[model samples]
Target chain A: PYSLGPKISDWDEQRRDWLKQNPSFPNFVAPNKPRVLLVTGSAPKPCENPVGDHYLLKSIKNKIDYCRIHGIEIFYNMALLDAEMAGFWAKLPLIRKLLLSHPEIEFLWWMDSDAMFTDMVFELPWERYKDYNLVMHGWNEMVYDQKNWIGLNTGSFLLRNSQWSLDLLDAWAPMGPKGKIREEAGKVLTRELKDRPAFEADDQSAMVYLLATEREKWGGKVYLESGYYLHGYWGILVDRYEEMIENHKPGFGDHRWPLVTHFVGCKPCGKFGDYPVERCLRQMDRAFNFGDNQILQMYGFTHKSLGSRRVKPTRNQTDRPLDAKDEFGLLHPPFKA
Target chain B: PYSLGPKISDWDEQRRDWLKQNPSFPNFVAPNKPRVLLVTGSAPKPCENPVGDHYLLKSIKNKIDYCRIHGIEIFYNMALLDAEMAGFWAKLPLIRKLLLSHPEIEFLWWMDSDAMFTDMVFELPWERYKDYNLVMHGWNEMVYDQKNWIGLNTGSFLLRNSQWSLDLLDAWAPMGPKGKIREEAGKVLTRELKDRPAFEADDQSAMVYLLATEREKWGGKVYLESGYYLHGYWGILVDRYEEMIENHKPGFGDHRWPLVTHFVGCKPCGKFGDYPVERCLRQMDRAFNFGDNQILQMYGFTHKSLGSRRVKPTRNQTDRPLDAKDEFGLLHPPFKA
Candidate 1:
């Protein structure tokens, strides 16, 4: 049963007639495995702030250590499902019920719960998005030169699982919280994007007013990306995560690190106005201790700083810990050398 | 890069020559995706039980809603790795680094972060253990005639990612806390099992002393399922979870409801001694509100009893919320009528 709300737009030929009537559905014919999932959620109960569910339990173990070193698959949601398509339009009805019940997931990404991932060995390019169906990061001139609404940053994005992302989510979820001028299209998108906020209908100024006025039917697909960061902006990447972790260990040049930092209103679970939940819990503890010291430096261990408390071992632990092999450089444990 | 300590018994032909040198690796050929993962972890810190990471944030969202409706794959770990193969032999070097870096994971399972998933649509038979390499939940007189230590219940088992489950985890991790008689094989396996507790080693009495004296090499594949439960025992399944959610709905017989309920020593994150952290936070909020009222009753919502607080929805509103649309029974939303 495939269903997702706001009067469905025959969901683009009903997701191409349920993938031409379930033709070979091994979770989408598999490219070996995990074709991309991610999804994320928060706010349903217990977070009257006070470590808002311990900053979503270390932001879902920092996106499960970057989806277990990039095979990609995640899901968090706290289920409020339909109390008026809840906060942030409850991820467009759970991304339209995971693109109508996981048709072998071609892609879904989503992120948020204060987006993270701080470059845990970046990978995603999917051959530089071979003809995109939405990717998102932004700066097509803050969506065609400062039309603004913080331009693009639907917390994080990707989509692609097709039927042109179900006709761009039935034209980007009818200005959210449905009907009755859904706040009359939130006062015409709070005066069409210039820093929107009449309050209602805003899924990020309706995707910056569908990328500043529907780029001729989603300007041939929709990518954006901007070289790196699919969206950093944790008040400018938390003062450049200790200079991107001591310049990726031996100073080179083209500064980097941030496949996601995103804080946006420093409210780890409470107060916001002019930031200060101890500055959003010290900018989410130095951007999740700079992505858990790059996944505890390939599981040998690190976190000696960046708000250190535990993790130590790192001498590329040999007395035992990273037991794995079959090359990814001997199942990479000791990377400090 | 083949490694995993305690004189690694040639990790069963280093995971059979790393899948014959990665032949066509797509996370292991792929029978259309997710060939069972699960894993699980806890206690690096923060759970000196003040709501122990909110009972591992609702027991990893009740094992990510039973591995997102049985496609199966989960992780959770909080990273401890070593520190002398930590409490309960830290899932034996993360199940020998996920059976040598997940050769498209044929099976792993693991469980424990106080095991949960109170029968949210049970599945695992994996074709009646197609010849087996571990499966757990025992009986045969609790290991062939009351030799008992809990003859089985390695929190929740399964294994079979081959090399005979990495030669039964190098013969079940050197009696724990590595060498110097690892506390003289934990006081000779605490008098070889008779209700173990020399307080040193005991991954449940070292798997009931390797299923009571290595029965002629894991007594032909090691199954012992005892029909249903893959380990219930949360003090006799918290008094049959409100009589198995009011007899599945309308009275029946042969009783069910436990594809896991576990708990053991009601710890949750603090104190134990004959149980009481308010009896492990009301038996994990009535077994996760009885599996979040069977996944909010197929996303329609329920939880009025089993220690209710939220979820009510029920009559399955048509006034909008469950959208997308295709079919697992019209994606089942409004299930009540």
Candidate 2:
């Protein structure tokens, strides 16, 4: 049998030990703010999307930098995972497992690799979530009118570290794993999408189903914020970049200045029928640059150089798909993304 | 302003201190066997259920005796509480709170006051519960066909002392007492029974709701044993007592001798109940007497007089609805029969 790992009761001491060995680990301990953990994962396939690995790392660092600056703890893993292993669905179980490991953490934030924190000054709206356990932003049109799983996008969300959230995570995890609930979920998806010729099962759909059916138990606890702050692609932040930047203001909690911009359709690889790597890189840069400028303007130092802009490597250098293994040559590669 | 109480990690130390003060507490500590806890609660209203308090104490002592015999630890409380304050519904939160406080405990068994152990030699199927978190005996008819909250009666059950069960209890608690859901549940009941002259809600409905809706998540982990061994009345046990005794064979894990006989519908008060106090006492006496006889027969001494039986008290002695305070006159009266 596998070891139980650290006991939840011994978290404080374990955390102390963790920090003693890894001094660079960000200390998010604070009485004023809820103890939060920023988690992001990537399954970088060297053959499928070479440049996509770079984007994954870039997006992950975006969250890491923000957490570090704000004194928020983070756990980022980019192990090469196969889709048949449930790809992103494994995130729910992984998260639940972590929640048990770290009961001290009060909140968990999940950001997809396709998403990035555009504003460094945009602290999470902790005050707004006093009454909620699960926080997500979705297309209001679908949420209010359609009232289906399609309404909420699970790419980015926040979950409280309560027993309710833990149980929710446990319930949500099985639907993602292989030989667990994929076949059952396939049946659900087939029934849910009988009219559509093509259909796929994902974690988001499972969440939507859970919320839709058990709204009183779970849906009421969910605070589906307007998609303004958690802006997504197509027409929101991706298509209307200039308009968003024009309305960008300093400080957080404003609809005009989105906290995070999800580049949903902007994949770095050409194979996914998304924007070319070159264009995605440019858009990615612009997204962060706009937020940096907003922050500089707020501090009355817009003229000075932006706060450590990530110098985009030349297209030629990052153009080739890199190998999955690191310089140490491990099978399960460590996090770079 | 209340304290957060003991941390889950401090269970070992807390258990040590708990045993230090309560030296009589059973010690089930073992390397191979998981730590187990037997918990039972009571809020005996002196005026309403005068003789019922005796049954409560009787049931509690039975558990204490079982734990002592098996070397399992226990926690029993019979503090006075008001119905408006939600007497029974509070058990869920109480169990969850205790689970958090006593993390060292691996299993928790809740026995109802109206229930008693008929077979003291019978032991919990610990090996059978290696994979289960929650264990109960319910009506298979209701569970299999209707698949609704009414399927499982929550008069008594066992729960694993795990984070998942803790979370489950926390989620189930809010539906009872002063929580917002209580009012909502009241409305649901009103709708369900439009013309009902009177109504009330308890934690059982909340449990039923949770298990019914989230069967795949919480209900699947539940080990619902058939009610024969954990027999109850009106007719399941009381009416069929003669038949049950006629087939009383020696050995465990058979329907011939029930491990527990729950006098569910029988009451001490001779009002608003099916069985009278005299009959309840006689049946309760006979229930144990029959089991003791079977055990004697198993031990090759069937001709010997049965073990000492509790004499049925006169109706006039227990018919009075006494005051809440003790005979000495004090607030928060102590437990007594």
Best by DockQ: 1
C-alpha local distance difference test of each model? 0.67, 0.52
Residues B1-337, candidate 1, lDDT per residue (tens digit)?
Answer: 1234544445445555655765544333234332677888776455664456766777887787677566565776666666677776888887766665555567788988788877765666676887777888877677766767776778888887766777777777767765554677778777866676666776767777876888888768988786777777788777777766665631121146667777887776656545767766777888888876776655556777777646676653342222433223323212101
- lDDT (Cα, 0-100) at A140 in candidate 2: 43
Query: Could you tell me the TM-score of chain B in model 1?
Result: 0.36
Real contacts recovered, all predictions: 0.15, 0.00
**Tens digits of per-residue lDDT for model 2, B1-337:** 1111222343444455554654332233443466676666554122244444334434444554344334454554333222334556746645654454444456887777677766555566677778888887775455644544445667768888665675566566555665555677756644443232224555655565566556778866788777346544434564555665467542353366567777766764324466566777667656655543432222122312222332221122111112112222111111100
> Tens digit of lDDT per residue, candidate 2, span A180-226?
35766756855663231233467776776667556667766788887
Error of 2 at B2 (Å): 65
Model 2 spans with C-alpha error above 4 angstroms: A1-32, A44-47, A80-85, A139-145, A179-184, A193-197, A252-255, A273-279, A292-337, B1-337
